[PDB]
Design a binder for this molecule. Structure first.
Ligand SMILES: *[C@@H]1O[C@H](CO)[C@@H](O[C@@H]2O[C@H](CO)[C@@H](O[C@@H]3O[C@H](CO)[C@@H](O)[C@H](O)[C@@H]3O)[C@H](O)[C@H]2NC(C)=O)[C@H](O)[C@H]1NC(C)=O
Ligand SMILES: *[C@@H]1O[C@H](CO)[C@@H](O[C@@H]2O[C@H](CO)[C@@H](O[C@@H]3O[C@H](CO)[C@@H](O)[C@H](O)[C@@H]3O)[C@H](O)[C@H]2NC(C)=O)[C@H](O)[C@H]1NC(C)=O
Ligand SMILES: *[C@@H]1O[C@H](CO)[C@@H](O[C@@H]2O[C@H](CO)[C@@H](O[C@@H]3O[C@H](CO)[C@@H](O)[C@H](O)[C@@H]3O)[C@H](O)[C@H]2NC(C)=O)[C@H](O)[C@H]1NC(C)=O
Ligand SMILES: *[C@@H]1O[C@H](CO)[C@@H](O[C@@H]2O[C@H](CO)[C@@H](O[C@@H]3O[C@H](CO)[C@@H](O)[C@H](O)[C@@H]3O)[C@H](O)[C@H]2NC(C)=O)[C@H](O)[C@H]1NC(C)=O
Ligand SMILES: *[C@@H]1O[C@H](CO)[C@@H](O[C@@H]2O[C@H](CO)[C@@H](O[C@@H]3O[C@H](CO)[C@@H](O)[C@H](O)[C@@H]3O)[C@H](O)[C@H]2NC(C)=O)[C@H](O)[C@H]1NC(C)=O
Ligand SMILES: NC1=N[C@H]2O[C@@H]3[C@]4(O)O[C@@H]5[C@H]2[C@@]3(N1)[C@@H](O)[C@H](O4)[C@]5(O)CO
Ligand SMILES: *[C@@H]1O[C@H](CO)[C@@H](O)[C@H](O)[C@H]1NC(C)=O
Ligand SMILES: *[C@@H]1O[C@H](CO)[C@@H](O)[C@H](O)[C@H]1NC(C)=O
Lengths: 1174, 120, 173
């Protein structure tokens, strides 16, 4: 232990130094420091420390001082080698102790900062608990590895932020301002009776503010943008929305908004606001930024972190290569009587090991399927059946426990971990019935669900799930402890920094002067906020804390939380995943038809036919009583489509044969579509053109594009891959359904029926629970009053395992879970009005669910998918499973052409002036100055802001003139140098197109005085300037390689994109048919609805990333009590205000699943390709 | 109450100037119309309290016989200063200054205490 | 709510016709108190004369004999926010031709801001006796038949050509 070559003052031979070393290494010192620091962390968790623990704080302080004294008397001063100043964490020790000695006396006035700086004490655990330093180190190498991807992410967000700034400059401010200026009564702010523009335009009660919403409505002058009501105009007027932080009006806020788009955090609101202000035609920009900045950049970050973690993991795995016995023998051994031993032998034989497992597992499955059947509205007979089945099942398990206990000695019985788990379960089961009148405590009955896990001995894959959960707290218990410590330190930093601010500035974020739902005042709520930031919803609370406690502090804190917490959660996820991983005319006619089928031109013709027939569905929307000529021509072309497809069916039959045709799935698909279309045809041709299931069969025409699945090769290959991978996914989905069934039954036991309201919707306030506690007095209020007071139910409730699965899929997708958790934590009793956060600790139920059934199940599912795709790749020699054969040739062409090319260096021409000009153009100095002026142009682009002074506009105009002149002069110099050989490299061609297009932009800026005044095309040709800053990637190497990886991986993305677009098309037609004419309630507005193909594809693309799909679903699930079953609906004979709930849930659940399986394969096609690069 | 900071104890010479402020820091930077500040003076701890200075949508001085034309408000509510200065201090002014403030948009209505004594 | 469709410009004598005018609010939430006037003039006649005024509860028609006892209202039923301005004529005569104009007057209600608006849509109808069924549908029927026939002819020509070619190929060996 000693090993002391120190040889310092206070000689190492001294008694005091030897005693200090002896006590220092001694493990009881480490244990008492553990106790001290854990109690310190708890007292930090304490919000307002009462003065009767101020001395306890001094006690802790003194313990730290004693430790510091010991470490100083054991090689203290920095001069000597191997001192404690060489070890970095002792810098933290000295810092925290010295700052405590600063704190307890007079100090600086920033009390909050000095109070916060105590978090180093909690950080000490990272230093002192064994093994954590290595975990932090590994995190450090992974971060060090992801540098190039950080650089490319920064420059890509910069480019896209400039695009968004130049396009949506100020558009977010567009508000419906009262236009018919009422001069005669336009008072001034100081009572002048005069009218000032800058006061009228910013007066907050001159805006619209759609009744019910908070922000004033965004509006727009474009043909497709939002629509001002009658008596308003669309001038930009006042502060931006979301307190002013959602804006493109400056490069800072544009960068914030596009970092928000990158992580897709609440990006559907930016989507809706910007499309409502600037017009729906700008959805192209959002598609471009979601398929580049969101999917691709996040995929690249995850792939690089995964590569680094795999490299480090493989490197670190490769580098390695009696006293109680005597009491037990008397009491744990139950052989004391000969007849007792005979009974033991008998019952051990009566176990029937081959026929005991089946009986017990059958009882477990029947028990879980009895616990599934639960409701709030329960008939007394049904609850009696549930109770008697509960008693029967618990009796069966008690019988098994006692039988095994008597059959095998309790020593060897408890010697099995499975048996100790069974004993825990049976004890928990028995303590229920005896305690049948305990107040509250409905959580206890939920522990019975763990019996299902006894099927782990049966399933290998449920064993894999248990293996993952064990490795979380087993081999990686130290890393999950690092995660817990970090989620603790951030939780307490937030509470010490913004905790008092959230209470001082309450009326700035919540209009009722109450604490917001998710604040940082207590410790529980601060932990909830940091957990939410780990889930992904940072922006919606960053706005609030910026509004209460300064922008800079929240920006720094929340960026730190995101980066560090997401790094640690990602590392934990990959740690778990890598732990898991390891005559003679019939024959001639047949062959002639075969030949006519196999003709390429004919296939192209049928492709065009299916495209036209499928696109003819788009025109069938609510704007169909207009353009009656279009409806008539398309209806009469529907007949010829049916004819040509029946003809194709018949001719394919003749060409192939009935057996050959009906043994193909695609041919069954085509036959089914043609048959249903023809059945509808004959039905409409006959008098039975309506009044039956024929109309409901009419909407099935949306399945017509499926023929493109058979025809188009890329979609066929992708669907082939997905279907082939389904069998390895069925078992994992069974595990996920069983485990989410456990969670859903527990949720039902906790919440069933505790999700009811009493709106007085005239005021639409959820009655505070002192006017109406019970449901019964809410009925009293009804019977006294009229329907203007109701007893609503949260629509995504937990009231049976079906609604449980729905609400729990919402909670697990992190969309729509906020209302569920609000109505849960407000829930108190089954027939009692909810009270605001009267059950706050039900939050931990959703925390547990997100940890287990959304994180661990996702980990299992992803691991199985990766294993399956590794297998499938290994089957066909490692080739890709998302490319056609010609796409494979394309792939190999880039694989060969991506190498190092010995390009011609353009030998010098035979002129001295040409010699010197090529010395100029070939010198590295000329390149680097070009890059620096590109950077200067980039900064002078980002400095352009809304509401900028006209002088600044002129200065920017002239500096842009200077820069474009410089670039054009360089271009023409290189042309005079060698035009013909400088038209050889594509980079130069990009330069020429950008310079000529910038010249076009500036000429048209000068000559906008013409007959073709177009501001929008003018902003686009301004965006054309941005292309020049893309030349910086030429001077980069890793960024160029990564862009090459994207280029090389495009074809698979293209095939999956065709499949995803075709799925969007089918579901959009289904929405146009069903979910048109639905109430515009929440997430379905006057725009972003299903009333047209454009709006429907808008909504489907929003849902493809799961964003706000609760919003779209919610107005569907309402009922004629909360609807109008016979609405006027002018301009169309269709009636009814809301659709069918059942098809609403099937439409969105099946899209979320289908889209999830599609977008996942997009990730894999990207992630695995990046691995194969190196 | 309200986050109001004041000089805990101030000493003033006979007949010399004395400025006793009530600085305060709150959310919702102070507006002028809906804002209100009050000033109460007590000639001693357990005796009567007397209103002498108001600001309800405008500066309103009650002009008591104790502070006829001596207490003047030259503070800055926007700069979070509602200070009162007492020129020609007289020993029967020894007592308690209490400033009452209400920041409109918050409801953290609070109080203020100042103890002033005059030296012989 | 927004399907703004013109009425039809043909009415057949003796049976019923549906005069159609739909003024659609630009934002549907707004709740407004709306009433209308219908102005009418015959073909080759002087300026328009009001015929029916529907104000939020009941249809008051002018005492002209050209429309008495034969005009009924088919707009939005009893909602005070019409948004659907449709006149129904029973037993169409030859008189009911010329020019119709639906005058709609809206009083949109806002937070603290009333607004009075007027929109006028012009619809011209002509009365026939035989229903001159339209040109688009007829040309679409001829298009249907000609396309069906031409595709069948293409198929037969291609299959006979292939049959002859491959019979000539198989007679070689
Ligand atoms: C934004 O515009 C609205 C609409 O004009 C302004 O509200 C108006 O404010 C003026 C003065 O604040 C009110 O006039 C006053 O009326 C009272 C009678 O109650 C009279 O005694 C006063 O002498 C004075 O004339 C006016 O009634 C009020 N109108 C409405 C509909 O509220 C509002 O002040 C503007 N916002 C800003 C910041 O200026
Ligand atoms: C509210 O503030 C505005 C501006 O801050 C005040 O407007 C000012 O009103 C005075 C009184 O009429 C103006 O003074 C005179 O204006 C006439 C205009 O022809 C000029 O010929 C005279 O020589 C004299 O300057 C003043 O111009 C006008 N504007 C400014 C900037 O002072 C308004 O009076 C204020 N209202 C109240 C109730 O105090
Ligand atoms: C939407 O369209 C309108 C016009 O089509 C855009 O311009 C707005 O036009 C009105 C006049 O029709 C302007 O009102 C006047 O503006 C001057 C400007 O100094 C003001 O001093 C006068 O008192 C008068 O109110 C209105 O200001 C103008 N809008 C703006 C922002 O200046 C409108 O900008 C378009 N909205 C967009 C593109 O977001
Ligand atoms: C649900 O909340 C709404 C909130 O508005 C309650 O409606 C309000 O009921 C009060 C009852 O007194 C109405 O007050 C009345 O106002 C009229 C007009 O000024 C006055 O003539 C009467 O003497 C009386 O003061 C108030 O107008 C009314 N507000 C609205 C917008 O209708 C309703 O009572 C609540 N229902 C339940 C069951 O709690
Ligand atoms: C929900 O329903 C329960 C019964 O199903 C209600 O309990 C009953 O509450 C009422 C009023 O809250 C009680 O009446 C009052 O009782 C007090 C003493 O408890 C007495 O001093 C008064 O003169 C009056 O009689 C009633 O006694 C009580 N039932 C029993 C058996 O004690 C409960 O109040 C309901 N929740 C509400 C109304 O929010
Ligand atoms: N990034 C977020 N995505 C969605 O999930 C959260 C929520 O559950 O659903 C919607 C979004 C949400 N934030 C919250 O703002 C709120 O609750 C909701 O917008 C309103 O419908
Ligand atoms: C204001 O009122 C006067 C009446 O004195 C009228 O002549 C004028 O047209 C009105 N102007 C406006 C803009 O209301
Ligand atoms: C609304 O405008 C119409 C148009 O002339 C007019 O007849 C009517 O009286 C006006 N009503 C109100 C309340 O302004």
């Amino acid at each position: 232990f000693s090993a002391t070559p120190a040889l310092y003052i206070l000689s190492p031979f001294n008694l005091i130094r030897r005693i200090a070393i002896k006590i220092l290494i001694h493990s009881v010192f480490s244990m008492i420091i553990m106790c001290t620091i854990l109690t310190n962390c708890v007292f930090m968790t304490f919000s307002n420390p009462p003065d009767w623990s101020k001395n306890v704080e001094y006690t802790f302080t003194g313990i730290y001082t004693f430790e510091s004294l010991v470490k100083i008397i054991a090689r203290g001063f920095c001069i000597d080698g191997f001192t404690f100043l060489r070890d970095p964490w002792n810098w933290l020790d000295f810092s925290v102790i010295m700052m405590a000695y600063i704190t307890e006396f007079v100090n600086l006035g920033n009390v909050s900062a000095l109070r916060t700086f105590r978090v180093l004490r909690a950080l000490k655990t990272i230093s002192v608990i064994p093994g954590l330093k290595t975990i932090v180190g590994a995190l450090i190498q992974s971060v060090k590895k992801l540098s190039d991807v950080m650089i490319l992410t920064v420059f890509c967000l910069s480019v896209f932020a400039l695009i968004g700034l130049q396009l949506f400059m100020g558009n977010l401010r567009n508000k419906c301002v009262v236009w018919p200026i009422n001069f005669n009564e336009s008072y001034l702010e100081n009572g002048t009776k005069g009218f000032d523009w800058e006061e009228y335009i910013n007066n907050k009660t001159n805006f619209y503010t759609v009744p019910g919403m908070l922000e004033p409505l965004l509006c727009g002058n474009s043909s497709d943008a939002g629509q001002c009501p009658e008596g308003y105009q669309c001038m930009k007027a006042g502060r931006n929305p979301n307190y002013g932080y959602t804006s493109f009006d400056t490069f800072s806020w544009a960068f914030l908004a596009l970092f928000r788009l990158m992580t897709q955090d609440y990006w559907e609101n930016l989507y809706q606001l910007t499309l409502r202000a600037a017009g729906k035609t700008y959805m192209i920009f959002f598609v471009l930024v979601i398929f580049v900045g969101s999917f691709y950049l996040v995929n690249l970050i995850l792939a690089v972190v995964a590569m680094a973690y795999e490299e480090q993991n493989q490197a670190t795995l490769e580098e390695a290569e009696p006293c109680w016995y005597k009491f037990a023998n008397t009491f744990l051994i139950w052989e004391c009587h000969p007849y007792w031993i005979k009974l033991k032998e008998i019952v051990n034989l009566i176990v029937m090991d081959p026929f005991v497992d089946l009986a017990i597992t059958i009882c477990i499955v029947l028990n879980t399927l009895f616990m599934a059947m639960e409701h709030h509205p329960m008939t007394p007979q049904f609850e009696h059946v549930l109770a008697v089945g509960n008693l029967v099942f618990t009796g069966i398990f008690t019988a098994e426990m006692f039988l095994k206990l008597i059959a095998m000695d309790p020593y060897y019985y408890f010697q099995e971990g499975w048996n100790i788990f069974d004993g825990f379960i049976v004890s928990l089961s028995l303590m229920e019935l005896s305690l049948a009148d305990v107040e509250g405590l409905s959580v206890l009955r939920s522990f019975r669900l763990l019996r299902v896990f006894k099927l782990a001995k049966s399933w290998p894959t449920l064993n894999m799930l248990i293996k993952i959960i064990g490795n979380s707290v087993g081999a990686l218990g130290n890393l999950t402890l690092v995660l817990a410590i970090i989620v603790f330190i951030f939780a307490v930093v937030g509470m010490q920094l913004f905790g008092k601010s959230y209470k001082e500035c309450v009326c700035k974020i919540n209009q009722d002067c109450e604490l917001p739902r998710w604040h940082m005042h207590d410790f529980f709520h601060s932990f909830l906020i940091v957990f939410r930031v780990l889930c992904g919803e940072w922006i919606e609370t960053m706005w609030d804390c910026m509004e209460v406690a300064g922008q800079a502090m929240c920006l720094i804190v929340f960026m730190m939380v995101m980066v560090i917490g997401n790094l640690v959660v990602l590392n934990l996820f990959l740690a778990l995943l890598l732990s898991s991983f390891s005559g003679k005319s019939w024959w001639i006619l047949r062959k002639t038809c075969f030949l006519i089928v196999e003709h390429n031109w004919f296939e192209t013709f049928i492709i065009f036919m299916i495209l036209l027939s499928s696109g003819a569905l788009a025109f069938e929307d609510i704007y169909i009583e207009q353009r009656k000529t279009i409806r008539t021509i398309l209806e009469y072309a529907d007949k010829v489509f049916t004819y040509i497809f029946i003809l194709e069916m018949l001719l394919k039959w003749t060409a192939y044969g009935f057996v050959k045709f009906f043994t193909n799935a695609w041919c069954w698909l085509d036959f089914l579509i043609v048959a249903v279309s023809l059945v509808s045809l004959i039905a409409n041709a006959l008098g039975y053109s309506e009044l039956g299931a024929i109309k409901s069969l009419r909407t099935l025409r949306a399945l017509r594009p499926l023929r493109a699945l058979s025809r188009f090769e890329g979609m066929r290959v992708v669907v082939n891959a997905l279907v082939g991978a389904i069998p390895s996914i069925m078992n994992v989905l069974l595990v996920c359904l069983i485990f989410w069934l456990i969670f859903s039954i527990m949720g039902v036991n906790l919440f069933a029926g505790k999700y009811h309201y009493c709106f007085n919707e005239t005021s639409e306030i959820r009655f505070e629970i002192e006017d109406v506690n019970n449901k019964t007095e809410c009925e009293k209020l009804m019977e006294g009053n009229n329907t203007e007071i109701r007893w609503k139910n949260v629509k995504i409730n937990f009231d049976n395992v079906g609604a449980g699965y729905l609400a729990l899929l919402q909670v697990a997708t992190f969309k729509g879970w906020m209302d569920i958790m609000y109505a849960a934590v407000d829930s108190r009793k089954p027939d009692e009005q909810p009270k605001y956060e009267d059950n706050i600790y039900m939050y931990i139920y959703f925390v547990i669910f997100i940890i287990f059934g959304s994180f661990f199940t996702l980990n299992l599912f992803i691991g199985v998918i990766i294993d399956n795709f590794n297998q499938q790749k290994k089957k066909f020699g490692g080739q890709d499973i998302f490319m056609t054969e010609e796409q494979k040739k394309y792939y190999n062409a880039m694989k060969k052409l991506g190498s190092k090319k010995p390009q011609k260096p353009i030998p010098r021409p035979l002129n001295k002036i040409q010699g010197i000009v090529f010395d100029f153009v070939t010198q590295q100095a000329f390149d680097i100055v070009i890059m620096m002026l590109i950077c200067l142009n980039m900064v002078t682009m980002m400095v352009e802001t809304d509401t900028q002074s006209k002088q600044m506009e002129n200065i920017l105009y002239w500096i842009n003139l200077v820069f474009v002149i410089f670039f054009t002069c360089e271009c023409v110099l290189k042309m005079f140098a060698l035009r013909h050989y400088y038209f050889t490299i594509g980079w130069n061609i990009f330069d020429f197109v950008v310079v000529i297009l910038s010249i076009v932009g500036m000429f048209l800026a000068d000559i906008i005085e013409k007959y073709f005044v177009s501001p929008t095309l003018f902003r686009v040709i301004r965006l054309a300037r941005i292309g020049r800053i893309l030349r910086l990637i030429k001077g980069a190497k890793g960024i160029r390689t990564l862009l090459f990886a994207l280029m090389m991986s495009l074809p698979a993305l293209f095939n999956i994109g065709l499949l995803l677009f075709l799925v969007m098309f089918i579901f959009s037609i289904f929405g146009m048919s069903n979910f048109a004419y639905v109430k515009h309630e929440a997430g379905i507005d006057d725009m972003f609805n299903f009333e047209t193909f454009g709006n429907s594809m808008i909504c489907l693309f929003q849902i493809t990333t799961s964003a706000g799909w609760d919003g779209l679903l919610l107005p569907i699930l309402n009922r004629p009590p909360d609807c109008s079953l016979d609405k006027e609906h002018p301009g169309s004979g269709f009636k009814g205000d809301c659709g069918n709930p059942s098809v609403g849930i099937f439409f969105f659940v099946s899209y979320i699943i289908i889209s999830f399986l599609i977008v996942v394969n997009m990730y894999i096609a990207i992630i695995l390709e990046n691995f194969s690069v190196a | 109450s309200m986050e109001v900071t004041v000089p805990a104890t101030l000493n003033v010479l006979n007949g010399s100037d004395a400025r006793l402020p009530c600085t305060f820091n709150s959310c919702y930077t102070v507006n002028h119309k809906q804002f209100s500040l009050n000033w109460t003076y007590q000639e001693c701890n357990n005796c009567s309290e007397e209103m002498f200075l108001q600001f309800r949508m405008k500066i309103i001085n009650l002009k008591l016989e104790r502070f006829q034309d001596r207490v003047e408000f030259s503070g800055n509510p926007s700069k979070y200063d509602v200070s009162v200065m007492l020129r020609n201090v007289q020993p029967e002014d020894e007592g308690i200054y209490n400033c009452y403030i209400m920041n409109p948009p918050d409801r953290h209505r609070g109080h203020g205490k100042i103890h002033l004594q005059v030296l012989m | 709510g927004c399907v703004e469709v013109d009425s039809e410009t043909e009415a057949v004598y003796g049976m019923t016709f549906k005069i159609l005018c739909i003024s659609c609010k630009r934002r549907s939430e707004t709740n407004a108190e709306t009433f209308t006037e219908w102005t009418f003039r015959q073909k080759g006649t002087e300026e328009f004369v009001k015929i029916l005024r529907y104000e939020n509860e009941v249809l008051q028609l002018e005492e002209d004999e050209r429309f008495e006892g034969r005009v009924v209202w088919n707009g939005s039923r009893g909602t005070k926010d019409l948004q659907d301005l449709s006149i129904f004529i029973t037993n169409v005569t030859y008189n009911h031709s010329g020019d119709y104009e639906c005058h709609v007057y809206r009083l949109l209600f806002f937070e603290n801001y009333e607004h009075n608006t007027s929109v006028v849509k012009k619809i011209h109808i002509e009365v026939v006796d035989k229903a001159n069924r339209d040109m688009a549908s007829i040309v679409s029927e001829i298009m249907m038949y000609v396309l069906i026939v031409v595709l069948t002819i293409w198929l037969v020509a291609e299959m006979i050509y292939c049959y002859k070619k491959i019979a000539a190929a198989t007679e070689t060996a």
